Every structure is written in structure tokens, then in C-alpha cells.
Amino acid sequence: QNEGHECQCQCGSCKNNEQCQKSCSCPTGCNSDDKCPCGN
Numbered sequence: 001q002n003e004g005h006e007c008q009c010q011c012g013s014c015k016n017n018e019q020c021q022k023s024c025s026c027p028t029g030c031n032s033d034d035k036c037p038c039g040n
């Protein structure tokens with residue numbers, strides 16, 4: 001669960017919706033769409 005980072009999602013849901021831009025284990029590399037089952 002490595003989500004102690006800055007939301008690094010290059011999507012439109014994270015890059016914008018800051019409701020989940022602070023606790024997602026996305027390994028600051030998330031750059032795909034079927035690799036973002038993030039909701040927080």
C-alpha cells in the first residue's frame with residue numbers, strides 16, 4: 001500500500017478530482033487507464 005505520495009495519476013479523474021489525489025497507492029508512474037482502479 002504505497003500511497004504516501006502526491007497523486008501522480010495522469011488521468012482526468014485524479015489530475016482534477018482532488019478527493020482522491022492524496023491517498024492512492026499509485027506508484028508515481030501510473031500512466032495507463034486499465035491500471036487505475038483507484039478511488040482514493
Ligand SMILES: [Ag+]
Nearest residue numbers: 007009024026
Ligand atoms: Ag492517484
Ligand SMILES: [Ag+]
Nearest residue numbers: 009011014036
Ligand atoms: Ag488516475
Ligand SMILES: [Ag+]
Nearest residue numbers: 009010030036
Ligand atoms: Ag492513472
Ligand SMILES: [Ag+]
Nearest residue numbers: 009014024038
Ligand atoms: Ag488516483
Ligand SMILES: [Ag+]
Nearest residue numbers: 007014020021
Ligand atoms: Ag487521485
Ligand SMILES: [Ag+]
Nearest residue numbers: 024025026038
Ligand atoms: Ag490512485
Ligand SMILES: [Ag+]
Nearest residue numbers: 009026030036
Ligand atoms: Ag492510478
